[PDB]
Amino acid sequence: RGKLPPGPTPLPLQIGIKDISKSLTNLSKVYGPVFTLYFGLKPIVVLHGYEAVKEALIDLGEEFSGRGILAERANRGFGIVFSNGKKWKEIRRFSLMTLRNFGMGKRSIEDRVQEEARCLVEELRKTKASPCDPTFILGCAPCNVICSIIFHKRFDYKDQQFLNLMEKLNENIKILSSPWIPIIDYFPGTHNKLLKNVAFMKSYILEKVKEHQESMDMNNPQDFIDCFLMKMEKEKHNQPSEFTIESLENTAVDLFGAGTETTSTTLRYALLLLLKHPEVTAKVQEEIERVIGRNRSPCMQDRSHMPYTDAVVHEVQRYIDLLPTSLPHAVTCDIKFRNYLIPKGTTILISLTSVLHDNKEFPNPEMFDPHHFLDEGGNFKKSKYFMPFSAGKRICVGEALAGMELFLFLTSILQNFNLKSLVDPKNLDTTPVVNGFASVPPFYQLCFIPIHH
Ligand code: HEM
Numbered sequence: 001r002g003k004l005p006p007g008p009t010p011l012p013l014q015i016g017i018k019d020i021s022k023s024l025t026n027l028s029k030v031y032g033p034v035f036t037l038y039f040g041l042k043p044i045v046v047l048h049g050y051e052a053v054k055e056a057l058i059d060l061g062e063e064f065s066g067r068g069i070l071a072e073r074a075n076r077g078f079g080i081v082f083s084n085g086k087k088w089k090e091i092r093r094f095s096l097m098t099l100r101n102f103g104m105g106k107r108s109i110e111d112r113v114q115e116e117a118r119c120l121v122e123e124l125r126k127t128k129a130s131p132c133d134p135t136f137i138l139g140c141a142p143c144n145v146i147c148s149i150i151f152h153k154r155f156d157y158k159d160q161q162f163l164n165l166m167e168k169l170n171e172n173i174k175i176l177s178s179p180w181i182p183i184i185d186y187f188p189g190t191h192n193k194l195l196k197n198v199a200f201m202k203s204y205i206l207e208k209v210k211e212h213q214e215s216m217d218m219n220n221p222q223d224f225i226d227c228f229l230m231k232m233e234k235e236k237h238n239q240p241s242e243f244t245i246e247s248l249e250n251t252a253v254d255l256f257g258a259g260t261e262t263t264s265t266t267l268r269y270a271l272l273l274l275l276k277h278p279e280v281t282a283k284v285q286e287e288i289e290r291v292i293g294r295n296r297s298p299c300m301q302d303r304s305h306m307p308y309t310d311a312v313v314h315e316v317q318r319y320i321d322l323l324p325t326s327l328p329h330a331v332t333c334d335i336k337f338r339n340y341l342i343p344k345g346t347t348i349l350i351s352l353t354s355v356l357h358d359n360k361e362f363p364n365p366e367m368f369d370p371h372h373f374l375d376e377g378g379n380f381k382k383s384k385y386f387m388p389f390s391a392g393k394r395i396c397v398g399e400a401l402a403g404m405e406l407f408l409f410l411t412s413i414l415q416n417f418n419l420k421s422l423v424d425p426k427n428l429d430t431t432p433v434v435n436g437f438a439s440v441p442p443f444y445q446l447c448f449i450p451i452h453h
């Protein structure tokens with residue numbers, strides 16, 4: 001019945017995602033672009049190289065759109081990230097369109113992101129050009145964009161309610177992306193801190209949902225909760241609906257989480273690379289002058305006029321390889337793939353590293369170089385190998401939102417400040433710190449000096 005691809009014999013100090021990714025690439029030279037690993041008896045089919053990822057995720061997108069299963073009695077399978085089947089499908093679709101300004105009133109997403117870019121620059125001023133770990137401030141901006149989308153609220157960076165939300169978020173994140181040693185490093189007294197925090201986040205959202213239910217109005221939705229509340233309205237006498245209070249709560253939490261950390265970390269990584277490559281930062285600052293000036297705030301229509309800057313933002317995401325193995329997929333049914341027969345349910349692991357760091361598409365793929373996204377005349381050159389957000393039907397739902405944040409926030413920063421390293425660029429170490437899921441940048445500090453020539 002099942003014929004899985006070949007692989008090494010089963011079962012196989014502190015091991016991070018980048019070490020895992022490197023092992024995966026070494027195994028592909030032995031067995032080729034598609035291979036199986038077993039862990040005891042649980043098999044995992046690995047897809048390595050662009051032709052394998054495309055054929056599977058894109059040309060057989062439906063079959064490969066499942067999500068890999070611990071299970072958590074936390075019971076978090078009711079949103080988007082952890083859901084499967086019919087439920088995932090409708091919730092994902094609904095979320096996509098709401099995130100593209102459908103059903104959410106007349107204020108745009110861009111507007112939200114631009115408002116936050118202004119506050120982000122205000123807070124950056126308050127560090128007074130003195131040495132700063134940007135971790136916290138860069139966390140708060142994406143978190144507020146999402147708060148605003150889901151609840152219609154943004155917060156001061158000192159507000160204790162906003163602080164608590166982020167703390168609980170960071171905690172669950174740290175727990176879940178712990179390194180391996182075989183098995184996941186974690187177990188101490190941690191499974192319970194997870195579940196508690198989860199319960200606290202879901203209650204905080206449910207409290208907001210109760211308020212929204214009071215003033216609810218088919219003609220005036222203004223955020224995700226209203227839009228979701230009003231879809232439940234139209235889905236009565238269509239029992240049993242996928243749209244419930246339970247799944248609204250789970251979906252909003254998925255979006256908080258997924259939306260705050262990935263962008264935070266990418267921004268922090270982008271500042272590190274800009275400190276290390278000052279000639280790149282200068283051409284970015286030149287381009288911003290020439291197209292935007294220091295007068296008005298950046299907008300998305302500027303990007304088309306700013307090829308160099310566009311290549312830099314692209315090259316940060318390609319270089320850093322934020323999620324080397326994406327998140328685990330699974331096949332939705334039994335499927336013929338090349339010469340293999342993969343049973344319904346089998347875990348699929350996708351090597352995004354093998355794509356982003358392809359040595360023919362991106363010669364010297366280990367180096368940071370904006371010309372990876374420029375043609376020989378200096379125009380913007382897009383690439384089918386740009387898959388930081390994955391590909392196919394499970395492509396990141398906040399793809400468009402994340403592109404906006406990275407561009408608007410990075411250009412606002414660079415429009416108003418120069419960046420100064422305390423360590424000499426020459427020596428500044430930029431190797432990622434070990435993490436079980438993601439490429440995380442090392443600690444660094446810098447000063448934001450308000451702008452002068
Ligand atoms: C630099 C920013 C970001 C990167 C690099 C990134 C990358 C990814 C990747 C690789 C996945 C997994 C896709 C797969 O399974 O193959 C994912 C999923 C997801 N992203 Fe993002 N993401 C980012 C920002 C965001 C933002 C801002 C949101 C806000 C809405 C978001 C919401 C999600 C959700 C909900 C999923 C789960 C999708 C599903 O299972 O269908 N992401 N992202």
Ligand SMILES: N#Cc1ccc(O[C@H]2CC[C@@H](NS(=O)(=O)C(F)(F)F)CC2)cc1Cl
Nearest residue numbers: 076081172173194198253254257258261262
């Ligand atoms: N990139 C990315 C990315 C990062 C984290 C992530 O999971 C988040 C983990 C934290 C929140 N989930 S939760 O309920 O605390 C948990 F993890 F299930 F316990 C919200 C989802 C999901 C994604 Cl897509």
